[PDB]
């Protein structure tokens, strides 16, 4: 057990931006925080840090309180809107950050090319880009041995050839027993890696847990889209009555959603008649779980 | 210690700032200028060995050597906070005082390197031109000047920390920072005369040996007259100026722990 | 009224030398012979309390090793200890010890008198209306008063209209007036001290004199009163601690809060290199006192160091020393031993700077000194006495402190 | 024909960031720039804005050079890592901005509900969230009515409910005659609103024009990942001989990947008589072109 | 105007800078200090509320009224360059030089609002206790004074602008603004004064008070310490300026020309930003 929040709410004077957050964590998990902007995800990891006082409770971070530097060593932090000292060599900033983390200069070299900035290293970071800031912003969290990891929108402005590269690096990190904390706003991609989702409400929490039992309580349809399969008439009248929404288009395709237990039994009959050309089907995803859980309460 | 590392950051920050080492070039031309002043008659540095040029140099240092300290640490917290990157340091395994004093002695070694390359290069300029054989005195009476020169700079640099941690905007930490430069240079010495000119009978002359302690400026103007020639001896006058150092920083450290 | 032969003129040797034996001689002696008075230490003359005890009018008298006590008190009749005519020419007195009521030395009219090493402490029992004048001169040229230790008098050593007049090494204590001068042109006084005196140097309407090396030590409200004396050379002289109070008499003076140098209308005077220490008012001025020379002198300790009363722009500091003002603001700006940074100090700041010497640190703060610079640029307090215009140095005449 | 880049290269000291870039832009077009995180995508916009000088060419934005401010009245812009003066209200920055763009107070009051920050105004920008900063930068781009927009990665920290909302606002601005220049890194979602693509190299351009004809020279396969189509062993060798692959995983799962020409008739055999339990079809997407063009250039 | 919009912005954040509202209180107690003090014997002195004591305030404003202007305009270019709003601000329909003079008089009005209330109480301090003085010459004393201060307060804005147009880091802008406070006030007072004793012992002494106008700050003393004040005597540098035979408004226009040379240099380096 690493991070344990105990019923804590958080205010900004009268602006109580957190409502009664009780949230725990084991020691190998991968967490996904979601929700709207302003829901408190940047406020959440600050409360995991010592940056904010737990107003109506306390946190238990590695069995401890977050104001201790022996507890504040093995975490790994990356914020949103990350910025640095704009006048230095970015390796030298990381060489400056290595002295604060205690890791030697044998780590700063490979981490610069793990995020792949060695082609344009040793320049000013104000002469970098938004990806090149965030790739440098990734690397300071990679210093030493981060047992805890904290990721406040890490994938912003990143190449998708390298966005899932950190996901495999995330997948390389929970195998060696390092629990991460990940919030994101791109909802695809992360679902291969998230062990437990923690989508939360406005000030409150909505739901917790892993992916599949979160799909239980959500009424979830599968989604089928087509364009000119064989017919328009029979596809409408087969699903206006048989427990589905036959959304009645006209280009010889009726885009009917099935209820995801109903695609097992009749899509063998369906696309045998609707002779298929290029048709994709959409499982009710975590993104589809999100908008339900957004609309589950207000 | 990790407190040296942000000071090891800041030595680059006074050199990669090429024009922050070059405040010693400001600090040299006051030294080579008014030594060769001779404003009444000559202008050729006659009594350079005599500390009347040093007491004149100790005079106008009270203008700007507090002010040089005020132009560095006034934004070392709040402009860093408006820069926003200090929270990453707060995630990094640091005490807040360990953040603070390494930010202090980082800037505290900027000007301490700047005096002996600014004034101490001009000591060599006097040692090669005036032909005054003053090896014993200028090793010492400059040292009783120049170690006070960094230390008057050291308290005002700490006096910038007591409000750069307080306020949440940069130009407010330059507006309100001028009030202590208004106080200790211009008006707090002035109201002591206005205290004295009102009470001709009161304000007993044994009180005022402890009223010179309340100004950090005039005690810098008190150890100027060591070699030039007191109710208070010099050794307790050395410690009371650095008594301002400790009571500034923990006042800042309680303020810095409330952001 | 006893004669010279009432005394015993034992002559073991000739050449008109007369040794005297010991004895309790009585009577107001009238010695009328040219006498080498080699008097015994055991010889004590007890005079009878009425009348002058030693009339001497014969010339060529040498008096050594004597004493006398309790002579007359008729001060209108001049009941002195020793009575001297103008006919007593080139007379000498030395080593004389006195504790009697009236005058110590009456001398008038004669020339070339020598008063060498004399312990004349007459009477302090009166309240200085009739304590007695110590040494009264009256137009006596050739005056030599040397090393004379005197106490217990009213108004001290009197000098009236003399011109050969030398005052060397004489110490006076405990008197109303130390030395008195009426109309005595071209005088000369050397190294004389006035301890606990209601004044020490009373000088009226003389001329042409020199004042050398006289130290005024622990005096009461009046150190030196020049009155109507042009051609006044006052050099090397020391002034310490004139203070509060009165003199009791106040005949033509005003003994008050303490004036170290009372100045009353010289036309010409060079008072140069004199020390003045710890008065209340340092320099009294009179408005008719003009054309003066004060260069090289020393002004420490005093509270209101100059009372500038004239309507006059007098500089009186001819390129020497603005005379060591301890309240002189303005450090040595020009890089030499030459100072001369401003004019004199004259304000009310001297009172508190006497009261607090620490505030001269606050004087030379650069916030204050630029405000001091506009006060020299704009004299709102209308003082005609710029009156130094050459401090030009740091410290003169430290050698005058050799007490 | 709005933006006309004419063979332009651009340097930095001695380091170039562009290899002879030529580009056109009409009026109903929507262009999506993609590439590496140092490929030139931020600095391309600054030549359009006239923040830089075209060293090896020129650009006629609306027929004119970009240094004219009267060009910039019909021009809106959002940068990456967008900051404001953080001591002001949300409304006070915009009312300051409305004085610049000449729009009155009757735009900011509804541009606030164009992003839905009606509660969020009259508070300090240093108290805001990531998206609450981002919508303020989104609002000033929509200030007045400009005809050209440059959304330099607009999806920094945005709700995926709200992310498609501005795409509808793009699509509403697309039918209002305003061409929009875009660069992004969330590669799904944008392509339905993309009229033409702008994939480019480290210094070069890679391709231009619409999504359909850029799939022509990018011959990229259509993929079917599944578990239990019909069987493993009988459903294995009848697809590799059809010019395709059939990855015979033992747990009743075949990964048939067709090469996009014989997707017509073979899906009648694949899912017209196949029995669906867990099947996921994959159309060859546009990040796969970014996979392809990175393998083309590099 | 289009230029007024940031000038309308530049008062509001200075209002939001709630302790830059408090710039006037330190700027007022320097007045009501020296209304009631002085060199010696100065407790509650209303008779020495003379214009020479107001001419003392110009010598005190030789130092800090430049320096208040340097602590504002030293980061109105670089502080938003690496603050990350100027590349937003270049998109708005503005010239690059059009935003400089808006930030110039936007900074130029907030101290102009500060100076007329910094001695506005000192105007009423005459009405408070200073009885037996003529308000009509004090109306012309402060009219010689208060508008002359803020143009010198304007002239160190554009000194701070051309350095902050030049440099591209935060602390070096502060590091250079202390430099131009030193050399253009304290050093350049005495370099001419060190010239006139030996190198101008006998060489070329004709056009010497014409050389005074390269320093701008002593002109502000020479405007006010001469003024209509009677004495002007023994003022160590201003006695040299008393030998300058140009009339009174010639000193007024060259300081306004010292605005006019300096804003052109701000238009230069910001175009080369
Ligand atoms: N310093 C502050 N003062 C007052 N309110 C604040 C402060 N910081 C944050 N808030 C409020 O807390 C709310 C949540 O902030 P936070 O950024 O944690 O939410 P979020 O869901 O993480 O948003 P985002 O994902 O865009 O960062 C914000 O809407 C803001 O109104
Ligand atoms: N002002 C500058 N001076 C020197 N070099 C610069 C400057 N600005 C950018 N660069 C460099 O030139 C390249 C320009 O690329 P740019 O900043 O447009 O990247 P990008 O592909 O847009 O990345 P991102 O989309 O992550 O911002 C960058 O790699 C950067 O390192
Ligand atoms: Mg967040
Ligand atoms: Mg970019």
Overview of the molecule:
The complex is a heteropentamer, with two copies of chain A (298 residues), two copies of chain B and one copy of chain C (403 residues). With 298 residues, chain A is of the alpha/beta class. Chain A has three domains: 1-76 and 147-217, 3-Layer(aba) Sandwich (Rossmann fold); 81-145, no CATH class; 223-282. Chain A contains nine helices and twelve strands. Chain B has helices at 3-13, 18-21, 23-34, 52-70, 78-83, 86-91, 96-118, 120-126, 135-140, 143-164, 172-175, 178-198, 234-241, 243-256. In chain B, 63% of the residues lie in helices and 0% in strands. Chain C has a single domain, classed as 3 Solenoid (Pectate Lyase C-like). Chain C has three helices and 36 strands. Chain C has a twelve-stranded parallel β-sheet with strand order 1-4-7-10-13-16-19-22-25-28-31-34, with no helix packed on it. Chain C starts with 16 loop residues before the first strand and ends in a 26-residue tail after the last helix. The chains are: A alpha/beta (298), B mainly alpha (259), C mainly beta (403). Chains in contact: A-B, A-D, B-C, B-D, B-E, C-E, D-E. At the B-E interface, helix 2, helix 3, helix 4, helix 11 and helix 12 of B face helix 2, helix 4 and helix 10 of E. The complex binds adenosine-5'-triphosphate (2 copies) and magnesium ion (2 copies). One adenosine-5'-triphosphate (ATP) sits between chains A (12, 15, 17, 35, 37-43, 80) and D (127, 129-132, 157). Chains A, D: It is found in: Cell inner membrane.
